[PDB]
Ligand binder design. Structure first.
Ligand SMILES: CCCCCCCCCCCCCCCCCC(=O)OC[C@H](COP(=O)([O-])OCC(O)COP(=O)([O-])OC[C@@H](COC(=O)CCCCCCCCCCCCCCCCC)OC(=O)CCCCCCCCCCCCCCCCC)OC(=O)CCCCCCCCCCCCCCCCC
Ligand code: BCL
Ligand code: BCL
Ligand code: BCL
Ligand code: BCL
Ligand code: BCL
Ligand code: BCL
Ligand code: BCL
Ligand code: BCL
Ligand code: SF4
Lengths: 143, 102, 358, 61, 15, 362, 358
């Protein structure tokens, strides 16, 4: 959308191209939203990252082409911390982080809190996620 | 059952339309506040221990922010029951009738 | 009266991006504690990736200053990269000019930052660690062409001093940190170890003799020191993807201080943990170092912080609380925020955390 | 009712009524200046008498 | 838990 | 309109005891409407000091210090049971044990420590010619036998990390001071004139304890003061065990909610009243280290303090030469407020060490 | 409240003479930071030259004081001269009395001051340099008669401690800086090296044993230390043609400080080039030292500076600007000057330089 027709402090991350974008796909996502759905270890130590779109029709992999489409501001990748292929103890990490600012009137809101964490690509390290002031990588590390 | 549904407490605006469709006999969906509700401090959650995989919250097609996902039994994460086909778009203006381009 | 006007603007970027537009103004009608006045300075910083395949970024900083009608310039370019999680390597050149005198320098250095402990009881019980004691091991190799007779004089005097006295290693710290820099070292928790001069040799370079001097030092931290406790945070090489620019500079005279700093760089907002973003914990060394110099006058502060979140991004736990809001353009002004601004301008360390997430 | 004003139709009586109203207004201005001064002086927690120079403790006096 | 009460407070700095 | 006022409210109450007794009920509350200089807020703390005389045959006393704190949702706790005694006029011993808990982590410790406080000089020309000597340089030599069981994973990790650091790094003796003064603690080290010598280690080893490995560390360090150091310059009477006959307690705490500090301090301990000669007593002249250290945080916001000191004296004792002068006298209890006393309170809250001596006799 | 009143007067002398009478008054209503009160001082510094042949000048200093009713006195006279441009030699006696105790001492001390660098790049570019990092080397032989018993006790204890304890050479800095002196050591930039003692011998003199101590040390400064960076300016012997006296002292109580300073000495004015003179740069050590003590009470300052130039001299570029030039009678008060006075009273070192020429 044109800069002069948008809310003043809008970055290119939130400025959408394809001027009629909202009706081409889901209107919630300015850019196509992909989810890390599985990260398994088979044969060698390398893990197979599975990028299933929010539409849920395909089962893709990071790949140089989608990496380029990421670093060109066209797609976004999230992990859904409830992912069962996690390495860090997200259930304890989410709970003890909500205990700083959440009062359990329901006594179970913190327990069942799940959120998405975005994934970015530098280059030297692959698809890496920055979580809790530390930069984890999907390759090893974060899984 | 399978195909658990979940709520992302990162897109959810707490509207509770998902809670309206959850069966009262299973309080799967709830509220957490952590602050004032004028700033989105009323997110919703899905109690996976109480959720019985109704599809009611997701198949109702009312989540405005795409927080309901319905992870598929194998690994697939949906976001909305059907998604438009991601079309290439352009403006069609004719040459010297109807429009004149320029 | 001595009223201190200041407007701060923080415009963040969303998604996985951590970038932020930071422009700040300051107008303090008080005498600066500079023994030489007027002290007008211009600071320009830039950085861009060289090859992100292995982390090189070309960071260039130009300092232009006129202190008591003495035009001072320092340009430096560096190719810095994180060789390891704890080790960093850099290489570059620059020049230093004061009036007619000007000597160019080229260097190659490696800084290795160690933490005294890596206990995970602290990590899993302190959600926002701040004080992280450690020690940086600078290993600096710098070559300076010796063209002017003043370069010859400096080099000959330095080598003669090193050969003569055995206390050059610790007495250099008196020279190295000119004036109140030495006191700033102690107040910030820093401690400079005796430098280990590994050799001062000159060789005839391209056009003349070049003074190549290997030396290293190990400067530690009690926890406040920014260069150690936030070693992985002060150098966001992984989350750099485009040229990042910061243009600072102050016009200062005997009866006022005028500051105007612009900014464009990642690391403004860091993940607080579990998807919750936050403005990065305030770098403590600038606060404590402005501490010996912000306490000399009582001042009335009207400070305006204008934090502009990206779309969909809400806030939680603003302390002090944001004063007004325009659905993104959160504004801090007066009340507890001006009190916190006075506190940190006089050297305070009090926390002002902005926990924001969509 | 206090006699400061009058329901008098003659100009000479309203002379005195206006004089009384003006005097009471000036007295109100003086007392209000003193009382606003006291409100400011309590608002800043500096209860020190300007003439004799002592202070005044709000918690015990 | 005294922090939580301050954490979960509506903005009280309105004009 | 006016300048940034930032009022600070505080009251102080001292109630003394008569005769040779040196006891005193100290009661203090404070409220500063300024942001505390802590990088993690809000902070809370609940300090309990409990003291009971064990046996006056040679000087054992049972001192218990329990600290409970809440710092940015982190629940911090630390308790110290200790049996301190004065084996010699110049040497102090202590056998103690305690525990520290942060969040879920917690490790117990037991220690046998001995501190030797030596003054550089004992010149009579100072003692008989300076009636009230404030500064007195010295040096304390700590000798600690602390035994920590290693039953947690991080306890073991800390143990091998430390032993590897000692074996590999030859500078561990002095680089320990950087880790060992968290943040501004090292900066406050210089403010009071405290110089920490390099620690010297008699050895680290582990042995089979009652239920598991126990990390036993024998280390010594010494700290010397230029005169402000109250743990050195006032060593002899900071530990009134000879004049302790009944249990002594101090309860302190503060709230640090990022918009202000609210302090509650109790107290019941001997040594409050110290003799000044000729039957004239005095409140113990103020410790230097608290004032100088709190000056490092009290100068960030200008403030119009509203202080109130209430000293209560035993029957027959009359106060004389109180500088600044006491505001009022209701029979037997004197009160300070405003004027020069408020200026002194601001002076000492910003770090000043001006003399405020209260002399009283009968 | 805490009103601060002060008047400063500087009447100068023309021509090649840099002489100037400096007498100042000060009244502060804030309690002093002295743990013993009330504290009083009387300071009398008088200097007269022996003869221009070798630069010897008699300098006598009397320090009368009463702290907590304890009588204190310190009278020292010494022949001080610069035998070289970097080394100064002094011989003198003196006595120190506290209450009834008193010990007279005699010493022959030679001090050499060495800068780390003497580069022409700095000198030809910086017109008014402030910081000169360097080391000042002390060398003192001091003989104190041991007539009373307490002197003998101190002497025996000291020789026993030096012979037995090996850490004396650096633990002497703990005893040797009373209280806040140790903190002011680093707050001003001074580093006291370990003293090395060439011997503690004794002999029978005119009446009894004399404790002769031959020791030396070196204090290094980062630039603010005026005893190092201004070595050639603290001791202006060549321009001392008449006796110079400086009387000063303060009457300090539990609720105020009353300062009177009287002075008449050369070096008040320093040349700035092209027949243009100026007041000497303010010594930064007094400012940074009083800042450690002049920040405990907020104060409103009413200061009046008044310089009286000789006939024909006119101030140009007064910063902050003067108020009224009643001929050569120039006055500063309020406005920016009061702000600078509060600045320096709280520890500021900002430039207030006054330039004039005839
Ligand atoms: C007729 C309407 C004229 C056009 C209205 C403009 C609407 C624009 C708007 O509302 O956006 C806010 C807009 C600016 O918002 P902002 O820039 O984001 O800054 C927000 C504040 O800083 C501070 O923001 P905040 O978060 O602190 O609060 C927002 C506040 C913002 O409202 C205002 O700023 C204006 C309030 C004016 C109150 C006038 C009281 C009567 C005076 C006569 O909204 C209110 O709550 C207003 C309710 C007033 C109740 C106050 C008394 C309660 C105390 C009880 C004891 O405010 C305005 O410009 C309105 C000013 C004109 C309204 C008064 C016009 C005359 C009415 C008097 C009758 C004669
Ligand atoms: C009355 C209280 C006033 C106040 C009183 C003062 C006074 C008084 C002064 C300042 C000064 C400064 N203040 Mg302030 N200040 C206040 C409010 C503010 C506000 C605001 C409200 O927004 C701002 C933005 C500032 C900002 C500033 C800076 C512009 C300026 C000092 C420059 C500096 O950082 O250089 C940093 C300097 C250095 C880092 C030099 C380091 C030199 C040493 C020898 C080198 C060390 C080695 C080096 C680190 C190695 C680098 C290697 C590379 C890292 C690889 N102040 C309050 C309101 N402020 C000072 C100034 O300069 O004024 C002109 C000054 O005198
Ligand atoms: C400042 C605190 C510590 C310190 C902490 C660090 C840290 C941390 C690092 C180094 C690094 C280096 N240090 Mg070191 N280092 C210090 C003192 C020194 C001194 C000295 C004479 O005192 C020297 C010669 C060096 C030498 C070096 C080089 C080997 C190397 C990078 C030089 C360069 O890029 O310069 C260029 C200088 C600048 C760009 C000028 C601006 C400097 C300030 C600190 C930058 C502010 C950034 C601003 C807040 C954010 C704007 C960023 C925009 C995106 C551009 N350090 C002091 C003791 N040093 C880097 C390294 O690892 O190399 C392997 C590194 O990451
Ligand atoms: C690490 C700091 C930067 C640097 C920044 C500056 C700055 C800033 C200034 C000078 C200035 C000067 N520089 Mg240079 N300069 C450096 C490297 C050198 C080298 C060399 C062989 O490496 C030489 C001969 C010189 C020569 C000169 C001096 C002759 C000249 C004026 C005196 C002075 O201030 O010196 C300063 C001396 C130093 C900062 C380093 C001297 C290095 C010595 C000769 C060799 C290294 C010795 C030892 C191994 C390193 C000790 C640590 C450093 C002292 C921090 N520079 C390095 C690259 N240089 C002044 C000027 O330009 O105009 C007045 C000045 O203000
Ligand atoms: C109707 C009168 C107003 C009032 C009007 C003033 C005014 C006007 C003044 C004081 C001032 C003072 N008042 Mg009053 N003051 C009021 C109620 C109080 C109360 C209370 C209710 O507890 C207290 C503790 C005080 C205490 C004080 C001291 C701070 C101070 C000098 C004492 C005095 O003059 O006698 N006032 C009443 C309500 N007060 C005087 C002062 O502070 O001088 C510095 C001052 O000028
Ligand atoms: C604080 C300044 C000096 C210091 C000065 C002293 C002094 C003085 C003493 C010790 C003593 C001890 N020190 Mg030490 N010591 C310091 C730092 C340390 C450190 C460390 C890791 O930093 C350690 C391990 C030790 C170790 C020890 C043990 C050898 C011993 C017993 C301590 C105790 O029982 O704890 C119990 C813990 C407390 C009671 C917490 C309360 C501490 C504060 C300072 C006391 C406030 C008192 C309050 C104002 C009024 C109390 C009244 C109530 C009735 C109690 N010290 C610092 C460097 N140390 C004691 C001794 O001699 O043992 C032989 C002793 O008297
Ligand atoms: C003297 C101080 C108290 C003490 C008070 C604390 C405090 C306070 C904390 C810890 C915390 C921890 N404790 Mg402990 N702890 C002590 C004794 C020990 C010993 C031991 C062999 O004696 C061990 C293995 C540990 C282990 C651990 C660390 C693994 C862990 C977090 C790292 C940290 O900084 O710790 C600090 C470690 C120490 C201060 C002592 C390290 C002892 C080493 C292994 C052996 C002595 C080496 C050397 C001779 C001593 C040098 C001086 C010491 C630094 C004082 N503690 C003594 C009894 N401990 C953290 C916690 O509980 O939850 C996060 C924390 O915040
Ligand atoms: C103060 C900062 C440095 C210092 C800097 C200097 C300087 C600079 C000099 C000496 C000199 C001397 N120092 Mg030294 N020296 C210091 C600390 C010491 C200490 C100590 C126990 O701390 C000792 C024993 C000495 C010993 C000595 C003797 C070797 C020698 C002769 C001094 C004398 O006779 O009285 C002289 C002192 C006075 C009579 C009292 C006046 C002192 C005050 C500080 C001067 C104020 C000047 C006033 C503002 C304006 C003067 C105008 C009047 C007309 C005089 N220094 C500190 C560390 N030292 C002198 C020398 O070189 O001898 C060869 C010299 O010029
Ligand atoms: C440079 C300092 C002045 C001096 C100034 C003072 C002051 C000021 C005071 C005393 C006081 C006293 N003096 Mg004396 N005194 C000096 C020289 C001596 C010598 C000697 C052999 O030279 C002796 C035995 C003494 C003896 C005594 C002590 C017994 C007594 C109180 C202890 C004290 O703090 O003293 C201070 C001790 C020293 C500063 C010097 C101690 C010298 C030792 C014995 C030999 C030198 C040791 C070493 C080689 C040099 C280290 C540096 C010195 C500490 C400066 N003085 C020198 C000339 N002296 C007190 C008094 O007069 O009434 C109570 C006091 O307040
Ligand atoms: S699937 Fe059924 S039980 Fe589960 S959240 Fe949705 S409506 Fe509730």
């Amino acid at each position: 959308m044109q800069p002069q027709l948008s809310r003043p402090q809008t970055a290119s991350n939130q400025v959408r191209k394809a001027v009629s974008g909202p009706w081409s796909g889901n209107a919630v996502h300015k850019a196509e939203k992909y989810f890390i759905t599985s990260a398994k270890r088979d044969r060698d130590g390398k893990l197979q990252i599975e990028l299933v779109p929010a539409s849920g029709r395909r089962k893709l992999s990071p790949t140089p082409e989608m990496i380029r489409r990421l670093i060109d501001g066209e797609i976004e990748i999230y992990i859904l911390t409830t992912q069962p292929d996690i390495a860090i103890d997200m259930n304890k990490e989410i709970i003890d982080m909500e205990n700083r600012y959440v009062i359990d009137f329901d006594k179970r809101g913190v327990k069942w809190t799940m959120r998405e964490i975005p994934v970015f690509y530098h280059e030297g390290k692959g698809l890496c996620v920055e979580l809790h002031n530390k930069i984890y990588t999907l390759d090893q590390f974060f899984k | 059952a399978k195909k658990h549904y979940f709520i992302i407490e990162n897109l959810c605006v707490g509207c509770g339309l998902c809670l309206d469709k959850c069966p009262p006999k299973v309080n799967a969906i709830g509220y957490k506040f952590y602050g004032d509700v004028q700033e989105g401090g009323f997110r919703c959650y899905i109690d996976q221990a109480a959720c019985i995989s109704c599809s009611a919250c997701f198949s109702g097609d009312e989540c405005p922010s795409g927080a309901l996902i319905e992870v598929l039994p194998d690994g697939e994460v949906l976001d909305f029951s059907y998604t438009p086909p991601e079309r290439l778009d352009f403006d069609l203006r004719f040459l010297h009738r109807f429009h004149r381009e320029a | 009266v001595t009223t201190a006007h200041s407007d701060y603007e923080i415009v963040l970027e969303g998604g996985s991006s951590s970038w932020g537009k930071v422009k700040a103004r300051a107008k303090v009608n008080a005498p600066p504690a500079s023994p030489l006045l007027p002290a007008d300075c211009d600071v320009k910083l830039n950085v861009k990736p060289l090859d992100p395949a292995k982390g090189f970024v070309r960071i260039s900083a130009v300092f232009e200053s006129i202190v008591d009608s003495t035009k001072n310039k320092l340009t430096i370019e560096a190719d810095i990269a994180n060789e390891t999680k704890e080790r960093r390597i850099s290489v570059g050149e620059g020049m230093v000019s004061v009036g007619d005198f000007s000597h160019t320098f080229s260097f190659e250095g490696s800084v290795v930052n160690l933490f005294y402990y890596r206990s995970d009881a602290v990590r899993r019980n302190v959600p926002n660690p701040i004080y992280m004691q450690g020690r940086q091991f600078h290993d600096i190799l710098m070559k300076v062409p010796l063209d002017n007779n003043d370069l010859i004089d400096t080099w000959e005097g330095t080598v003669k001093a090193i050969g003569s006295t055995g206390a050059f290693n610790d007495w250099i710290r008196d020279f190295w940190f000119i004036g109140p820099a030495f006191t700033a070292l102690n107040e910030g928790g820093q401690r400079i170890s005796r430098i280990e001069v590994n050799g001062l040799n000159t060789e005839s370079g391209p056009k003349g003799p070049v003074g190549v001097s290997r030396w290293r030092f190990s400067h530690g931290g009690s926890g406040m020191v920014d260069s150690i406790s936030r070693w992985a945070e002060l150098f966001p090489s992984d989350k750099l993807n485009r040229p990042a620019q910061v243009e600072a500079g102050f016009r200062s005279d005997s009866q006022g201080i005028e500051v105007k700093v612009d900014g464009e760089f990642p690391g403004v907002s860091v993940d607080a943990g579990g998807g919750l973003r936050r403005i990065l914990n305030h770098p403590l060394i600038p606060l404590v170092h402005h501490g010996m110099v912000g306490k000399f006058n009582n001042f009335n502060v009207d400070a305006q912080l204008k934090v502009v979140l990206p779309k969909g991004y809400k806030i939680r736990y603003a302390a002090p609380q944001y004063r007004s809001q325009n659905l993104e353009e959160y504004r801090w002004s007066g009340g507890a925020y001006a009190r916190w601004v006075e506190h940190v301008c006089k050297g305070g360390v009090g926390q002002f955390e902005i926990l924001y997430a969509q | 009712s206090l006699g400061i004003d009058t329901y008098s139709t003659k100009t000479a009586d309203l002379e005195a009524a206006g004089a009384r109203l003006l005097g009471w207004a000036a007295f109100h201005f003086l007392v209000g200046s003193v009382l606003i001064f006291g409100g400011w002086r309590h608002w800043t927690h500096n209860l020190t008498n300007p003439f004799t120079g002592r202070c005044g403790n709000f918690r015990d006096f | 838990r005294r922090f939580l009460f301050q954490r979960t407070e509506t903005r009280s700095t309105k004009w």
